[PDB]
Design a protein around this ligand. Structure first.
Ligand SMILES: CC(=O)N[C@@H]1[C@@H](O)[C@@H](O)[C@@H](CO)O[C@H]1O
Ligand SMILES: [Ca+2]
Ligand code: NA
Length: 140
């Protein structure tokens, strides 16, 4: 399994900060740039839980998902997550959940191959009460 092409995806999120340079549009989570990040909207803060959804560009049999946090800082580093999948873009179901440390390290989810047109990362808890993500990848 290899990473699906990010340019064939579309990212949307429940909350996103406007483009203020390197943050925080949902689409910055899939631009192949470690220095740009999705960040939940702040001023005013939109409280967790918040989610980011990747429309994959097709119906794929996916087996791995990676979460690269922002670097240089910690706000929004996700520490309690769910990963959900959908086959229709509306009906979602949980396939992964757990805890990550607030460190900058790549966080990797592996799961049984399952069919998906969309993947949704739910940030339940995150540093500062924000959620952010530098790069998200999905493997099929
Ligand atoms: C470098 C850094 O930490 N930037 C953060 C920004 O990403 C956001 O989390 C904001 C929340 O108000 O705080 C800023 O200081
Ligand atoms: Ca990025
Ligand atoms: Na709690």
């Amino acid at each position: 399994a290899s990473a699906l092409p990010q340019g064939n995806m579309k990212a949307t999120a429940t909350s996103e900060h406007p483009d203020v340079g390197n943050e925080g549009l949902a689409k910055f989570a899939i631009d192949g740039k470690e220095n740009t990040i999705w960040h939940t909207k702040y001023n005013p803060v939109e409280e967790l839980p918040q989610s980011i959804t990747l429309e994959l560009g097709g119906s794929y049999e996916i087996n791995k998902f990676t979460y690269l946090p922002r670097s240089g800082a910690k706000n929004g580093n996700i520490t309690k997550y769910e990963l959900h999948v959908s086959e229709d873009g509306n009906n979602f179901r949980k396939i992964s959940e757990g805890n990550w440390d607030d460190s900058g390290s790549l966080k990797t989810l592996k799961f049984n191959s399952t069919k998906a047109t969309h993947v949704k990362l739910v940030a339940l808890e995150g540093v500062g009460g924000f959620a952010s993500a530098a790069e998200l990848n999905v493997f099929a």
